[PDB]
Design a protein around this ligand. Structure first.
Ligand SMILES: *[C@@H]1O[C@H](CO[C@@H]2O[C@@H](C)[C@@H](O)[C@@H](O)[C@@H]2O)[C@@H](O[C@@H]2O[C@H](CO)[C@@H](O[C@@H]3O[C@H](CO[C@H]4O[C@H](CO)[C@@H](O)[C@H](O)[C@@H]4O)[C@@H](O)[C@H](O[C@H]4O[C@H](CO)[C@@H](O)[C@H](O)[C@@H]4O)[C@@H]3O)[C@H](O)[C@H]2NC(C)=O)[C@H](O[C@@H]2O[C@@H](C)[C@@H](O)[C@@H](O)[C@@H]2O)[C@H]1NC(C)=O
Ligand code: D21
Ligand code: CUY
Ligand SMILES: *[C@@H]1O[C@H](CO)[C@@H](O)[C@H](O[C@@H]2O[C@@H](C)[C@@H](O)[C@@H](O)[C@@H]2O)[C@H]1NC(C)=O
Ligand code: NAG
Ligand code: CL
Ligand code: CL
Ligand code: CL
Ligand code: CL
Ligand code: NA
Lengths: 280, 97
């Protein structure tokens, strides 16, 4: 199937000082946000009418209370153990947990943690793995977190039992948006000169959905290996923007075309032709 | 230990004077999360600006998308203004079609 294959929740916990800390949170289907989270009230924001998947209101209220109790409780515990862990304020903690549907049908779960923008820990086989970047502090955190069978059990259930059923239910409930097809539009421009006697040609591709797209600079049926892809950038309303550039000597730009292949085009590729002496 | 934001300003559609469009500002590669983002029209803050909630990439760097509807003209100038703990003063990146 096309569109996102994974669900994940993220956490950004900012510890300004010994008396102030706030947590930002959200829920995502790959890069598409489906849940917002209010930091001080500790409450979920449902961004799509199908954001609850196949979960009942009861179960969603239950999960919301789990996250609210976790988030407030996490800041409380970090503040208590900050001294023991030689923490200098301010510091920032990030987390990501979720699950993904693979080809063949297996659902794989993941939980990763960071401190100061660096890897801190990961979860493998329902266990706390310290990351080398976390050092003695990550080794210590994992030694301490396993002392609480309650947290551990809960993380296990959420990761390996709640997340897979949630993911299948929400990919189904949202399939009118998640598996829609939106056609790209493309256009050409000339970028800054990359060097002596050289031009940079730019092929812009924007407004496509889903994310997989193929853009290449061509000479007839021949793909130009010099084609440099830029970063796939977001647009509003769940679409993407991409620039494919080519460095060429002036005098060698004539005969160039940009070709776009995308699921939504149904084999009818977009073909743009670079024309010489400002005939674009 | 701290990473300064990268700023990318682009339009959703090819710019055509007098034709309605969307102005996007992608702010990424930064750390820590606290940041201030504004879209400007001739140096003045646009109030009807939408944005994504905070997200981060695989290296744990944060990113945000800020956007607004706009109609490009011959003379109107557009920009994305960003302030971060790593910057002494707001960094301004101008829209260039
Ligand atoms: C929301 O959706 C989830 C997915 O539902 C399916 O997909 C969606 C997109 C729609 O197309 C749905 O119509 C469709 O059901 C639900 O989760 C799934 O629920 C079903 C039960 O309905 C469940 O199937 C059972 O599986 C067990 C075996 O499971 C083990 O083994 C498999 C590998 O074989 C492994 O993948 C699992 O993790 C387990 O280790 C099996 O014993 C059951 O058989 C019994 O029942 C069937 C009839 O259902 C009968 O013919 C048999 O003879 C026998 O009695 C049964 O097949 C799926 O495993 C499960 N999927 C996942 C990933 O969990 C989800 O349903 C709820 O959770 C379930 C776990 C279960 O407790 C349900 O009763 C719950 O309603 C649903 N809702 C919520 C709120 O999550
Ligand atoms: C509609 C929305 C659908 C969502 C579908 C599910 C998606 C879930 C994915 C996995 C998320 C797992 C991360 C959340 C962990 C919560 C843990 C927990 O117990 O939090 C709560 C209580 O927590 C506290 O009070 C303790 C404070 C936190 C302590 C520090 C925790 C560190 C982070 C976990 C690292 C785990 C490493 C090893 C795990 C095997 C609520 O629990 P309960 O309800 O039983 O009272
Ligand atoms: C429905 C709505 C969906 C949206 C919800 C949004 C929020 C979701 C939050 C869940 C995100 C889970 C990500 C996993 C977090 C990983 O955290 C870390 O890795 C932590 C980094 C550790 C820093 C060390 C600092 C020292 C303090 C040690 C405290 C330990 C206390 C243990 C006490 C036990 C409590 C009884
Ligand atoms: C994955 O987690 C479970 C915990 O429920 C462990 O049983 C697995 O341990 C491995 O298998 C057991 C039976 C024993 O031989 C042990 O020495 C192994 O480590 C665990 N898997 C791993 C690889 O840690
Ligand atoms: C702690 O941080 C907040 C801002 O997050 C700040 O306003 C406050 O003054 C700090 N310390 C004290 C003394 O409250
Ligand atoms: Cl398909
Ligand atoms: Cl797994
Ligand atoms: Cl030209
Ligand atoms: Cl930049
Ligand atoms: Na600053």
């Amino acid at each position: 199937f096309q569109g996102p294959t994974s669900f994940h929740v993220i956490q950004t916990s900012s510890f300004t000082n010994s008396t102030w800390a706030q947590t930002q949170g959200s829920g995502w289907l790959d890069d598409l946000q489906i849940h917002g989270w209010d930091s001080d009230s500790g409450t979920a924001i449902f961004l799509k009418p199908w954001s609850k998947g196949n979960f009942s209101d009861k179960e969603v209220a239950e999960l919301e209370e789990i996250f609210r109790v976790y988030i407030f409780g996490f800041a409380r515990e970090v503040q208590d153990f900050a001294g023991d862990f030689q923490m200098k304020y301010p510091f920032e903690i990030q987390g990501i947990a979720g699950c993904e549907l693979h080809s063949g049908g297996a659902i794989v779960s993941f939980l990763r943690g960071a401190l100061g923008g660096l890897d801190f820990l990961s979860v493998k086989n329902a266990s706390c793995v310290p990351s080398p970047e976390g050092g003695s502090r990550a080794q210590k955190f994992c030694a301490l977190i396993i002392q609480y069978q309650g947290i551990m059990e809960t993380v296990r259930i959420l990761l390996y039992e709640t997340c897979p059923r949630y993911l299948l239910g929400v990919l189904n409930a949202g399939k009118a948006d998640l598996q829609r097809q939106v056609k790209p539009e493309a256009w050409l421009s000339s970028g800054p000169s990359p060097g002596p006697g050289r031009l940079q040609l730019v092929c812009h591709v924007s407004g496509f959905y889903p994310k997989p797209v193929w853009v290449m600079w061509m000479r007839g049926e021949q793909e130009q290996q010099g084609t440099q892809l830029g970063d796939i950038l977001p647009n509003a309303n769940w679409t993407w923007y991409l620039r494919a550039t080519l460095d060429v000597a002036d005098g060698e730009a004539a005969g160039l075309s940009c070709r776009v292949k995308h699921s939504s085009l149904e084999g009818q590729d977009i073909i743009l032709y670079w024309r010489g002496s400002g005939l674009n | 230990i701290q990473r300064t934001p990268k700023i990318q300003v682009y339009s959703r559609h090819p710019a055509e004077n007098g034709k309605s469009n969307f102005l996007n500002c992608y702010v990424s590669g930064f750390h820590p999360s606290d940041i201030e983002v504004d879209l400007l029209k001739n140096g003045e803050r646009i109030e009807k600006v939408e944005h994504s909630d905070l997200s981060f990439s695989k290296d744990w760097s944060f990113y945000l998308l800020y956007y607004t509807e706009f109609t490009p003209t011959e003379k109107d100038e557009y920009a994305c203004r960003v302030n971060h703990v790593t910057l002494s003063q707001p960094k301004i990146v101008k829209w260039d079609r």
